[PDB]
């Protein structure tokens, strides 16, 4: 099985910048490779086939090269339309194999997250359940860790996280963390804390409330 | 031309089967192989196998040999992929491709879940915590099936400073959350409402965010 090692895995870029992505086959693949791009929630779009042939309709700022085990996709001048994940595919021999892809992302100043914590709503508490929500909004880079704590100790499960993709205007990211418990388990504890760790700081951003307060 | 059009989304029960189709248009069907690719958040892209409509020749990813069956039909220039004994591990988006052209994909969801209306809860700031020029309110759409469920703030009037997160499976059902941020002197003097609609169950829910205490 041919292994395609693709790099870099993450690309921090600026519009107009020149971009180079690489795919290395664990063996000679004889230029039988394609480069395709895929946008969030969308289907793949091929840019290059047979290592260096431009897909009809694809802008010339895209070009490919390589010949044995090393192939490269080059974007002469990065455009907003180009954001998404790039992938290479070898089809020289079965099974068809893919590169892990490289995420292209618009760079900008580091921004810490704006954190907000939300105790369960009364309506839900009446239903019998108890979800504690916590938003970590508008930060950069997309790298972020969240930890929960009930009455001082870490709560591992009952936690579900969700991320947005880079905002088109401010280039930040946002994630939602929800800790779900039963009404009864929730009412057996007092202080629920939400902790966010992000490159922008050593000490985590802490946000919490006590049930006894409200 | 250059086109591959795939059949619609599938909602199927575990242990069942499904057959997906891929209509080819704009080129000579019997001259190119058509391949199928699986894509899931956790496992990424996976080649399943290919078929040559002309020779009827096939090649499968050992991993799917016995799970997937590829066939093609000359007269309707359509490739087919059948999957048996579905198991949630098969829940994914499936693509047919000619290696250069790609279909738009077919979403397959393996679940036993029945249609369920979402319960919508108002997420109001922690008692106090106003400290700041702005305030963040939230809306939690919990336990519904199937997707999708669209939500807006103040019937669409509020769109800036809004973050509606991607839904996530929570114990067999779907859960979604959305935040909105307005200047502190805006709320609660002015009312903020969360509009949630779930077509599947013909559910239209609106709920005002009221302070706590």
């Amino acid at each position: 099985d041919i292994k395609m090692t693709q790099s870099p895995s993450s690309m921090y870029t600026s519009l107009g910048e020149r971009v180079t992505i690489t795919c290395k086959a664990s063996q000679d693949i004889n230029s039988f490779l394609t480069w395709f791009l895929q946008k969030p929630g969308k289907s793949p779009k091929t840019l290059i086939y047979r290592a260096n042939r431009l897909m009809i309709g694809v802008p010339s700022r895209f070009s490919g090269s390589g010949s044995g085990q090393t192939y490269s996709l080059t974007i002469s001048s990065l455009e907003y339309e180009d954001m998404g994940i790039y992938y290479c595919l070898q089809y020289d021999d079965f099974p068809l194999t893919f590169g892990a892809g490289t995420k292209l992302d618009l760079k900008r100043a580091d921004a810490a997250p704006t954190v907000s914590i939300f105790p369960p709503s009364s309506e839900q508490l009446t239903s019998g359940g108890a979800s504690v929500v916590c938003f970590l909004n508008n930060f950069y880079p997309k790298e972020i860790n969240v930890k929960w704590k009930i009455d001082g100790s870490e709560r591992q499960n009952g936690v579900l996280d969700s991320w947005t993709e880079q905002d088109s205007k401010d280039s930040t990211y946002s994630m939602s963390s929800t800790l779900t418990l039963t009404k009864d388990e929730y009412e057996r504890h007092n202080s629920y804390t939400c902790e966010a760790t992000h490159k922008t700081s050593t000490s985590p951003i802490v946000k919490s409330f006590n049930r006894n307060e409200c | 031309q250059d086109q591959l059009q795939q059949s619609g989304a599938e909602l199927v029960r575990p242990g069942a089967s499904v057959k997906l189709s891929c209509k080819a248009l704009g080129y000579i069907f019997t001259d190119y192989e058509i391949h199928w690719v699986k894509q899931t958040p956790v496992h990424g892209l996976e080649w399943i196998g290919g078929i040559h409509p002309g020779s009827s020749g096939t090649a499968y990813n050992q991993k799917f040999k016995g799970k997937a069956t590829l066939t093609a039909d000359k007269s309707s220039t359509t490739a087919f992929m059948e999957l048996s004994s579905l198991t949630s591990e098969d829940s994914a988006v499936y693509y047919c491709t000619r290696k250069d052209y790609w279909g738009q994909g077919t979403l397959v969801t393996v679940s036993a879940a029945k249609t369920t209306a979402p319960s919508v809860y108002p997420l109001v700031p922690v008692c106090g915590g106003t400290t700041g020029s702005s305030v963040t309110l939230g809306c939690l759409v919990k336990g519904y099936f199937p997707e999708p469920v669209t939500l807006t703030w103040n019937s669409g009037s509020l769109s800036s400073g809004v973050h509606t997160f991607p839904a996530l499976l929570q114990s067999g059902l779907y859960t979604l959350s959305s935040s909105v941020t307005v200047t502190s002197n805006t709320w609660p003097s002015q009312t903020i409402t969360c509009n949630v609609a779930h077509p599947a169950s013909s559910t239209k829910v609106d709920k005002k965010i009221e302070p706590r205490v």
């Binding site: 042939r53 | 001259d31 190119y32 040559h52 096939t58």
Partner: peptide, 11 residues
């Protein structure tokens, strides 16, 4: 545009 130089080997 592209020829069976995308595959070809039946299978």
């Amino acid at each position: 545009d592209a020829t069976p130089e995308d595959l070809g080997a039946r299978l």
